[PDB]
């Protein structure tokens, strides 16, 4: 009747609570959307529902025979293959018991003959449970819909941000009855989300997403679950209905607490100054100050320090010269015949779907690559700063402070001697929260940590690669209003189309079709011009794939 249900659930440290009194319940087919700020507990609720952790109070009770999947905020894999990335979970109770049916039928005669009736027929019983057991012709069904990489290559550095396309195929093949997909639209395309839109719509089974897109929240979701910092409140309706009734709620809450804060100060002097006023009653009126001042500090949350990018040396007049570069691999044809300068004091945007080669183009510039037939002039005044797409500089065992400081005391950032602990809290880690391991940090504080160890050089040429992931609108605005005030050459790879309309001066973009798949067009102007230049120069200016039989 209920797929999932919760008692008075309180997952917490006793010093710092992260969930508190989370009492709610879900139906079958309950398409849910989860919204909230960073630091609320949105991923520590989807972690209880998949059994990957246990609460410190209250029972979390899945239904009887409904299985649950999960896609965490960083997706793990195995280091074996790509078609291995459709057998580990997903088709895992059929594939592991598929070769054994072909192994039990090797025609032994001295070993056993009539014991093939209670084990080989028992394996014949479990193949009817899945209603299909050829498993081969219906596994290119699962990779010609995600547009997966070719299935015969391992997930080494060979895979970029289509690592997520594989982890959206281990999960969406198990078909769980409770589907906990936590931010599926990281690193995807202008059409990879557009595939996932039509797939999560007609989907028998419950869905909990912690997404930020607007097609899921306005048309697929039916319940919206706000996560306040520790609290949890359900609501009913799509996201257009949610924000209207959210607006009138924070209206009458905005002057609920104004006259509350006015009351505490009006009887602050009543309890501090002039304690001559009443004898032997004062221990009954003083407690009503404390009982409203201890609940005035459970919503006093307005301490949000700004993201600030430090400034180092004077940037000259030449930054990146690309001398007719070609780049590729054996048989592969990425970047071909590209020449562009890089404008001093200008945000540069990169446009392209997954699999064109955006993040290798920065690896040339720092030095992690070498061009095949071409050259890149660095210019003796720039200073690189490379934040990577895969966030590979995070060592998930040692604490936060040891990742960015390397155990030192002062680190060299802005041609000064900054005390390296003060450089940590500049990106939002106040004091005793240096001492917690980085592998368990939030999606905001793993993106407010990758900016720490990569902007540690004060460089006047910073190469932002997916900066708009897993961070809310209070920091996203505090980023884009902090890399406008930066004196030179921020270069950004992004997929948020409503981010490059804010902060762009130049666009490098892919425009390849069936004559050559490795063109790169350069543009002088913002994103609100390239979307109009494209329709007046080219002609390119759907038909959904099912992922299963039905």
């Amino acid at each position: 009747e209920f797929i999932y249900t919760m008692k008075k659930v309180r997952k917490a440290h006793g010093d710092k609570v992260i969930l508190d009194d989370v009492t709610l319940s879900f139906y079958p087919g309950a398409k849910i959307g989860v919204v909230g700020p960073n630091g609320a507990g949105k991923s520590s609720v989807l972690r209880i529902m998949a059994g990957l952790d246990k609460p410190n109070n209250g029972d979390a009770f899945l239904a009887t025979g409904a299985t649950v999947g999960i896609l965490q905020q960083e997706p793990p894999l195995n280091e074996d293959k790509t078609v291995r990335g459709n057998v580990e979970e997903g088709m895992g109770d059929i594939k592991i018991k598929l070769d054994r049916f072909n192994e039990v039928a090797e025609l032994m005669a001295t070993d056993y003959t009539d014991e093939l009736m209670e084990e080989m027929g028992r394996l014949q019983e479990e193949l009817d449970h899945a209603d299909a057991w050829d498993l081969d012709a219906q596994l290119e069904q699962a990779m010609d819909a995600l547009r997966c990489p070719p299935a015969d290559e391992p997930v080494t550095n060979l895979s970029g941000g289509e690592r997520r396309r594989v982890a959206l195929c281990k999960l969406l093949l198990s078909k769980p009855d409770l589907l906990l997909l936590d931010e599926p639209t990281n690193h995807l395309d202008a059409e990879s989300v557009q595939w996932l839109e039509q797939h999560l719509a007609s989907y028998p089974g419950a869905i909990l997403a912690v997404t930020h897109d607007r097609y899921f929240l306005d048309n697929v979701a039916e319940w919206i679950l706000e996560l306040d910092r520790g609290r949890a409140y359900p609501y009913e309706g799509n996201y257009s209905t949610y924000l209207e009734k959210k607006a009138e709620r924070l209206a009458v809450q905005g002057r609920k607490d104004a006259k509350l804060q006015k009351r505490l100060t009006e009887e602050l002097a009543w309890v501090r100054s002039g304690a001559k006023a009443r004898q032997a009653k004062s221990k009954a009126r003083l407690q009503r100050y404390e009982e409203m001042a201890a609940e005035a500090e459970k919503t006093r949350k307005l301490d949000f320090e700004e993201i600030q990018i430090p400034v180092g040396p004077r940037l000259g007049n030449v930054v990146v010269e690309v001398d007719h570069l070609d780049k590729g691999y054996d048989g592969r044809a990425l970047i071909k015949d590209l020449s562009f300068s890089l404008p001093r004091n200008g945000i540069v945007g990169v446009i392209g779907p997954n699999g064109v080669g955006k993040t290798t183009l920065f690896k040339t510039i720092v030095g992690l690559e070498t061009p095949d037939s071409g050259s890149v002039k660095v210019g003796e005044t720039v200073k690189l700063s490379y934040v990577d797409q895969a966030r590979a500089g995070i060592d998930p065992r040692k604490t936060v402070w040891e990742v960015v400081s390397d155990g030192l005391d002062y680190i060299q950032v802005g041609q000064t001697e900054v005390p390296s602990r003060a450089y940590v809290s500049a990106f939002g880690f106040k004091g005793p929260d240096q001492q917690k391991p980085a592998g368990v940090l939030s999606g905001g504080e793993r993106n407010r940590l990758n900016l720490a160890l990569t902007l540690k050089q004060g460089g006047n040429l910073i190469l932002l690669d997916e900066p708009t992931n897993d961070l809310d609108v209070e920091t996203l605005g505090s980023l884009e209003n902090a890399l406008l005030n930066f004196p030179g050459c921020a270069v950004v790879i992004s997929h948020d189309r409503w981010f490059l309309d804010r902060t762009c001066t130049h666009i490098l973009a892919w425009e390849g079709d069936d004559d050559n798949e490795a063109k790169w067009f350069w543009f002088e102007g913002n994103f609100g011009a390239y979307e109009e230049n494209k329709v007046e120069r080219l002609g390119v200016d759907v038909t959904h794939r099912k992922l299963t039989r039905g």
């Binding site: 006793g14 010093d15 001492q435």
Partner: protein, 48 residues
């Protein structure tokens, strides 16, 4: 900041010892070799 934790054995899960640790110094659960009387020999003990 010094809560009182109880220590339970690994095999029989009985609760034999209560003690105090500091919670901002030691976030994870302690492990000690203490004497379980129901087993008759020293065993390992986590928290609850």
């Amino acid at each position: 900041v010094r809560p009182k934790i109880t220590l339970a054995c690994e095999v029989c899960k009985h609760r034999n010892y209560i003690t105090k640790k500091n919670r901002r110094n030691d976030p994870d659960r302690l492990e000690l070799k203490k004497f379980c009387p129901n087993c008759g020999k020293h065993q390992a003990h986590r928290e609850t």
